[PDB]
Design an enzyme around this catalytic site. Structure first.
Site, short mmCIF file in Angstrom:
data_model
loop_
_atom_site.label_atom_id
_atom_site.label_comp_id
_atom_site.label_asym_id
_atom_site.label_seq_id
_atom_site.Cartn_x
_atom_site.Cartn_y
_atom_site.Cartn_z
N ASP A 64 -2.24 -0.61 5.85
CA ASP A 64 -2.55 0.22 7.17
C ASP A 64 -4.09 0.39 7.20
O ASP A 64 -4.82 0.97 8.07
CB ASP A 64 -1.74 1.42 7.26
CG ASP A 64 -2.35 2.76 6.39
OD1 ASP A 64 -2.52 3.82 6.69
OD2 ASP A 64 -2.64 2.19 5.23
N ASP A 68 0.86 -1.11 -0.02
CA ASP A 68 -0.01 -0.14 0.12
C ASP A 68 0.89 1.24 -0.04
O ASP A 68 2.11 1.26 0.26
CB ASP A 68 -0.81 -0.06 1.24
CG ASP A 68 -1.67 1.26 1.41
OD1 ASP A 68 -1.75 1.82 2.46
OD2 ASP A 68 -2.42 1.58 0.39
N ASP A 106 -6.90 -2.89 2.86
CA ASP A 106 -5.87 -3.69 2.57
C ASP A 106 -6.02 -5.14 3.29
O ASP A 106 -5.35 -6.17 3.20
CB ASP A 106 -4.66 -3.11 3.44
CG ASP A 106 -4.15 -2.01 2.63
OD1 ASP A 106 -4.33 -1.88 1.56
OD2 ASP A 106 -3.50 -1.02 3.39
MG LIG Z 1 -2.86 3.20 3.40
#
Ligand SMILES: [Mg+2]
Ligand SMILES: *[C@@H]1O[C@H](CO)[C@@H](O[C@H]2O[C@H](CO)[C@@H](O)[C@H](O)[C@H]2NC(C)=O)[C@H](O)[C@H]1NC(C)=O
Ligand SMILES: CC(C)CCC[C@@H](C)[C@H]1CC[C@H]2[C@@H]3CC=C4C[C@@H](O)CC[C@]4(C)[C@H]3CC[C@]12C
Ligand SMILES: *[C@@H]1O[C@H](CO)[C@@H](O)[C@H](O)[C@H]1NC(C)=O
Ligand SMILES: [K+]
Ligand SMILES: [K+]
Ligand SMILES: [K+]
EC number: 7.2.2.13
Lengths: 265, 39, 992
Positions: free
Chosen positions: C686, C345, C690
């Site tokens: 995070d 990410d 995700d």
């Molecule tokens: Mg992120």
């Protein structure tokens, strides 16, 4: 699972294991080189002599039927095996046997544990000293034996204080006594041996070992139980007494017997 | 000795055990010292 | 099952408000009926998420109790009770042997079960985190009246109302809104507020303004909407199910464990039954044939090995806990070392997740600011009088403020009330000019025009802090081009000057460059109003232009971006040097995604996309050979119409990949694509978007401070300080533990041979038993334990970060080379050293090696209390047994003595001990404690009963010393050959 590589890995392990075998053997060589031919390095593990008998006990027991032939023919096999060795034809000439006192005598030192002399001459022993004992088809005639230990001098107890068989026929100086027991006194103990004594004649000691004394004969002590009882397990314990004799709760053969006779007839 | 060679059939397993246990303990302490050089 | 959920969603934002009501039998104004709502409740079911069915811990524990070694140990434990049963019936055996050994072995299985159970842990509460995002209550309009209801009682069709501060209770079709902004970070990973209005604004429902989603929250304003989806049927409720439903799967390390279990189990059953028949042929009673088999089992199975592995893993996880890297699953300690591809990410992972000033354009010059958290860069300018003029506008023409009580925390980390751009500017000036509040106190704001959608600028009028003036200063900021159309002069190095086409062109150049860097650019200008035309009491009208807004002085430009975390660029390069492929997978827009890719080193300098080639050469993209482009940037909207085979080609054909504007399922798809090619993949993230990717990853790593609860539930590892450098450490630790496990496994296995061989020679030679079954367990469960563990503390033998990731198909934890060395070479030398001490003990007590062959018959005969030794002496039963058990004790101690050398040689696979040294203090500890344990077991009174261990004479300890030394020399010579010729012979044969 490789290619022709199978050869190279065979050539390796052949040489490798060959070397290892050659090294192992080398270390065995040096071990032997440090040892005597006449006497073992350690003797503390045989120290207190064991007492073993001829009747091959199934489990410290010899039960059979008097009114049956093949009921005791098993115990007579081992009994014969032992006494067959004490034959007179086996003890011929002044070599390597010697006529010793027909009465319990003192020790005999044939020098040291050396080869500086031939075969150390052992005392003769007649199976004919074993009175009364095919064997006892009724009321067995068990044969006792003290385990051989090189350089061991079995020392009898002195009549200073009290004794089990209190002072009776106490040949204090030259006899290692053997008194069998069971309370529970439902038997009839009868002992046979050298000089008619219920012990081991000290003139058969010390033992010089198989290498320095082959054909050597250890003293036997025949014991007969002409018990007037029948059809019951009788726990009979034969005990030897001495200064160098001790016992253990674990080793039930450390200077003593454990016989479970039963004339179930 | 001659007939008095009782020492031939004897071994001081008691001392050996005392010494063996001393050694085991000290090796145990030494190990702690080296391990505890930083935790 | 979940293949449906891996697809992009379909919606009804295209319908009119009225049309949408027909579909759901609803009223736009009155809302649903109390009766109709309750009807729909029973129909569709609750607005809730149901957690997936889990496997109870019962079945999880017992599943370990039947994995190769445990199976063999079970066969042993029962076979003990078998022989015991056969005894208790036949001849009354007052002993406890088979009974107790059967109890001991069954305990070994249970305890070993706990270790593997502890290792195979799965702490997963994905669906629980999602459930936390549904509010307890919602506001609905029913029978023309608004009431709060249990949010679970919400159904498709009713009229819902939301306002700033509340969570979207369900997927809504916006029908009415007033200044409504929403935080869609759940779906995008981006927290910038998105406007919501009734008007449809994109074909894509995840981008349109007239849809609001469950799992997000309203940030400001008010809105009303019609519920289109409820519970599991919402967009993120499906993501929830997808994420929670995904099959976990076996880790690389787990697969390795099972693999050597098969090997060792194989040789165990082989030799087991190979000698079971070999005994019956020799005329051994089944009574004995089973007793030998039990011994064979115990000899072949390394009883303490699986627990060693677990402890070595645990200890490695403890070290990483001490670098702010939390491991939730013990196996994930190794996966990072086997990782060949990282899918990362961007926002909050690679980046700080905070709009930060990156560059400034003043004095006809581009200046760069420091974007790093801890400010690890340098200054750009302080001297220029122009800077102070620009700095003043950035502070004054700004409505952002620091939250109360932050004075303790660093400037860049403190919470700010305001939009991202104003916060960035605030923190910029506060950093390099001190307290901004001071500047706003020295220059009192009298009138302002806040940033307007139409004006595209924000202006402010302040009392000049200067005493000699104390007059009125005008400042404004806005779109760079709009600010330009309002300027006549430029503050160059202090003094103003006319805005000639020259500087105007340099402005465009500066503007295009900064924008090309993916940075948001703002214009800044001011104007000192004429004193005579503006008295100290002159009133300014903000509603109607009461003051000039043209012919102003352009001061400068400022650019900003959500920047990389300081450690990220360097960590990315380090991953790439270790041969790990790094891919970006983000919900963010392509221009931003691509710019950070270059910033952190995902896309290296000079590498081009097909679009780059086309623009440079000024040719159509179809005219470009796509193989000429090693880099690519894929938008999610294009990804959607590509098959997996085509996704596989993208993955194969590019070294530098950026997946931008991806949905959560799309991240999962990219991860699966990478895995499909046979790669071990890590995911770093995070956000809740995700979660599926993190779950599917061989190892998911979540950020600890910036991470959402969901992401950290889906992960195997948490970076508690958001230190991306930890990934680099993790992969390094992962590789090191992999090598050290080999060392520890070889060490443990090596001692199997000296435990097997005595039992074999017992049969083939008919000699007294050299070593007992109990004695074996004193080794594998006792002495070898701490030494085997200590190998986990071994330093690397070379630069492990310099090698490529292991090939999980070829590079195994236990291979033929390990067995050859442990079983064929070193263990064989240990066996002999054991036997030697055995022959020494017996020969020194009177039983010379020659007379031992074929004596076991009379030796074991309990009724022969007069066995003749070599010297003609007679032994009772218990007497010779004491010597025999003393043989077991010295054979045992011989193993310990030969394991000394083995421990030292297993220290290194390649290097010499003279190179690696002896700096492992745990290992040395192992040596001392191992020897202490052995001595204690031999000399402690009473151990002769409980374990049949007998006191050894001093000379006994030294029997195996020459064998211990040969091992050290042999292995040292062998490894000397390895190093001296990287060719292959010694290497390809023995190099673990
Ligand atoms: Mg992120
Ligand atoms: C050991 O002594 C016995 C007893 O004498 C021997 O037994 C044989 O000789 C007896 C006469 O002396 C016979 O009556 C027996 O039938 C005969 N028994 C056997 C079994 O042969 C025995 O042979 C002697 N053995 C040796 C090896 O000297
Ligand atoms: C007690 C004694 C008699 C048993 C001796 C067993 C010997 C023959 C065994 C023990 C370990 C074995 C080796 C272990 C490892 C390998 C590597 C593998 O790629 C091929 C087989 C090979 C080369 C084995 C061949 C046979 C081997 C050398
Ligand atoms: C033993 O045998 C002798 C003959 O040799 C006999 O006189 C005696 O009665 C026997 N003794 C016993 C107790 O039976
Ligand atoms: K084992
Ligand atoms: K995972
Ligand atoms: K082992």
């Amino acid at each position: 699972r490789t290619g022709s590589s199978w050869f190279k890995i065979f050539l390796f392990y052949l040489i490798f294991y060959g070397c290892l075998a050659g090294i192992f053997i080398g270390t065995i060589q040096v071990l032997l080189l440090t040892l005597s031919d006449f006497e073992p390095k350690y003797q503390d593990r045989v120290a207190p002599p064991g007492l073993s008998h001829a009747p091959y006990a199934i489990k410290t027991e010899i039960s059979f039927s008097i009114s049956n032939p093949k009921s005791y023919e098993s115990f007579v096999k081992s009994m014969h095996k032992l006494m067959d060795l004490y034959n007179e034809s086996s003890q011929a000439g002044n070599s390597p046997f010697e006529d010793c006192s027909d009465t319990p005598a003192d020790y005999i030192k044939r020098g040291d544990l050396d080869d500086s002399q031939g075969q150390k001459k052992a005392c003769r022993f007649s199976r004919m000293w074993l009175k009364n004992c095919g064997y006892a088809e009724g009321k067995p005639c068990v044969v006792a034996k003290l385990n051989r230990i090189i350089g061991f001098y079995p020392k009898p107890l002195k009549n200073t204080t009290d004794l089990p068989e209190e002072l009776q026929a106490n040949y204090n100086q030259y006899v290692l006594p053997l008194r069998c027991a069971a309370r529970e006194k439902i038997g009839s103990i009868e002992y046979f041996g050298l000089g008619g004594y219920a012990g081991f004649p000290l003139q058969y000691y010390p033992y010089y070992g198989k290498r320095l004394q082959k054909k050597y004969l250890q003293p036997l002590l025949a014991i007969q139980f002409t018990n007037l009882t029948q059809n019951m397990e009788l726990r009979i314990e034969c005990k030897v007494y001495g200064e160098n004799i001790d016992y253990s709760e674990k080793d039930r053969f450390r200077g003593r017997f454990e016989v479970k006779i039963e004339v179930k007839s | 000795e001659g007939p008095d060679n009782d020492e031939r059939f004897t071994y001081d397993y008691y001392r050996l055990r005392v010494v063996g246990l001393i050694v085991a303990a000290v090796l145990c302490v030494i190990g702690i010292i080296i391990l505890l050089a930083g935790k | 099952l979940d293949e449906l959920k891996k697809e992009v969603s379909m919606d009804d934002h295209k319908l009119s408000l009225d049309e949408l009501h027909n579909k759901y039998g609803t009223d736009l104004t009155r809302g649903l009926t109390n009766a109709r709502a309750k009807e729909i409740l029973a129909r569709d079911g609750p607005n809730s998420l149901t957690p997936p069915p889990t496997t109870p811990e019962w079945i999880k524990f017992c599943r370990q109790l039947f994995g190769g070694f445990s199976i063999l140990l079970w066969i042993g434990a029962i076979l003990c009770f078998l022989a015991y049963g056969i005894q208790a019936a036949t001849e009354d055996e007052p002993a406890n042997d088979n009974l107790y050994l059967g109890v001991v072995l069954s305990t070994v299985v249970i305890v070993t079960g706990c270790f593997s159970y502890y290792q195979e842990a799965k702490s997963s509460r994905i669906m629980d985190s999602f459930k936390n995002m549904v509010p307890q209550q919602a506001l609905v309009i029913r029978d023309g009246e608004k009431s709060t209801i249990n949010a679970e009682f919400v159904v498709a069709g009713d009229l819902v109302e939301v306002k700033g501060g509340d969570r979207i209770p369900a997927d809504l079709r916006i029908i009415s809104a007033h200044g409504c902004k929403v935080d869609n970070s759940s779906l995008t990973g981006e927290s910038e507020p998105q406007t919501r209005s009734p008007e449809f604004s994109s074909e894509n429902p995840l981008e349109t303004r007239n849809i609001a989603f469950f799992s997000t929250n309203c940030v400001e304003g008010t809105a009303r909407g019609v519920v289109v989806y409820t519970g599991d049927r919402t967009v993120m409720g499906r993501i929830a199910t997808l994420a929670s439903g995904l099959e976990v799967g076996r880790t690389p390390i787990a697969i390795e464990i099972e693999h050597f279990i098969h090997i060792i189990t194989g040789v165990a059953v082989f030799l087991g039954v190979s000698f079971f028949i070999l005994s019956l042929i020799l005329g051994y009673s089944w009574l004995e044939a089973v007793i030998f088999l039990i011994g064979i089992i115990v000899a072949n199975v390394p009883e303490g090995l699986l627990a060693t592995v677990t402890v070595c893993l645990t200890l490695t996880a403890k070290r990483m806990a001490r670098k702010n890297c939390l491991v939730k699953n013990l196996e994930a300690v190794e996966t990072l070392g086997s990782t060949s591809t990282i899918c990362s990410d961007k926002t909050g992972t690679l980046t700080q997740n905070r709009m930060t000033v990156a560059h400034m354009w003043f004095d006809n010059q581009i200046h760069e600011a420091d974007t790093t958290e801890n400010q690890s860069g340098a200054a750009f300018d302080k001297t220029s009088a122009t800077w102070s003029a620009l700095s003043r506008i950035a502070a004054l023409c700004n409505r952002a403020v620091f939250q109360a009580g932050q004075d303790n925390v660093p400037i860049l980390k403190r919470s700010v009330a305001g939009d991202a751009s104003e916060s960035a500017l605030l923190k910029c000036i506060e950093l390099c000019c001190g307290s901004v509040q001071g500047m706003r106190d020295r220059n009192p704001k009298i009138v302002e025009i806040p940033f307007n959608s139409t004006n595209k600028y924000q202006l402010s009028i302040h009392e000049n802090e200067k005493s000699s003036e104390s007059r009125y200063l005008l400042v404004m900021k806005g779109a760079p081009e709009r600010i330009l159309d309002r300027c006549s002069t430029i503050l160059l190095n202090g003094a103003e000057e006319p805005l000639k086409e020259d500087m105007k062109e340099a402005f465009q150049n500066a503007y295009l460059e900064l924008g090309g860097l993916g940075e948001r650019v703002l214009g800044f200008c001011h104007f000192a109003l004429p004193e005579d035309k503006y008295n100290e009491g002159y009133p300014f009208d903000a509603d109607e232009p009461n003051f000039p807004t043209t012919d102003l002085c352009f001061v400068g430009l400022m650019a900003m971006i959500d920047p990389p975390r300081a450690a990220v660029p360097d960590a990315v390069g380090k991953c790439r040097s270790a041969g790990i492929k790094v891919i970006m997978v983000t919900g963010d827009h392509p221009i931003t995604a691509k710019a950070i890719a270059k910033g952190v080193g995902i896309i290296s300098e000079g590498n081009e996309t097909i679009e780059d080639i086309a623009a440079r050469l000024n040719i159509p993209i179809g005219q470009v050979n796509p193989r000429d482009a090693k880099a690519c940037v894929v938008h999610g909207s294009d990804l959607k119409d590509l098959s997996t085979e085509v996704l596989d080609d993208i993955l194969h054909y590019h070294t530098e990949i950026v997946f931008a504007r991806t949905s959560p399922q799309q991240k999962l798809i990219i991860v699966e694509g990478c895995q499909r090619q046979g790669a071990i993949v890590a995911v770093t993230g995070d956000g809740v978007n995700d979660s599926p990717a993190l779950k599917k990853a061989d190892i998911g790593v979540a950020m600890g401070i910036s991470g959402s609860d969901v992401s950290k539930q889906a992960a195997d590892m948490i970076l508690l300080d958001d230190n991306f450098a930890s990934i680099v450490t993790g992969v390094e630790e992962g590789r090191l533990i992999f090598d050290n496990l080999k060392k520890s496994i070889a060490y443990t296995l090596t001692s199997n041979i000296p435990e097997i061989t005595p039992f074999l020679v017992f049969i083939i030679g008919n000699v007294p038993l050299p070593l007992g079954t109990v004695t074996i367990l004193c080794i594998d469960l006792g002495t070898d334990m701490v030494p085997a563990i200590s190998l986990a503390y071994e330093q690397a033998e070379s630069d492990i970060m310099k090698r490529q990731p292991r090939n999980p198909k070829t590079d195994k934890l236990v291979n033929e080379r390990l067995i050859s060395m442990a079983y064929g070479q070193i263990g064989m030398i240990q066996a002999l050293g054991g036997f030697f001490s055995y022959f020494v003990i017996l020969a020194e007590n009177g039983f010379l090696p020659m007379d031992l062959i074929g004596k076991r018959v009379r030796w074991d005969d309990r009724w022969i209390s007069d066995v003749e030794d070599s010297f003609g002496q007679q032994w009772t039963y218990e007497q010779r047994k004491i010597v025999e058990f003393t043989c077991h004790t010295s054979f045992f101690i011989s193993i310990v003595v030969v394991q000394w050398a083995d421990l030292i040689i297993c220290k290194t696979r390649r290097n010499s001990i003279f190179q690696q040294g002896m700096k492992n203090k745990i290992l040395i500890f192992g040596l001392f404690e191992e020897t202490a344990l052995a001595a204690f077991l031999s000399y402690c009174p009473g151990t002769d009963v409980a374990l049949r261990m007998y006191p050894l004479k001093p000379s006994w300890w030294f029997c195996a010393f020459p064998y211990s030394l040969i091992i050290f020399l042999y292995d040292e010579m062998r490894r000397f050959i390895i190093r001296r010729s990287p060719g292959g012979w010694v290497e390809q044969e023995t190099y673990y």
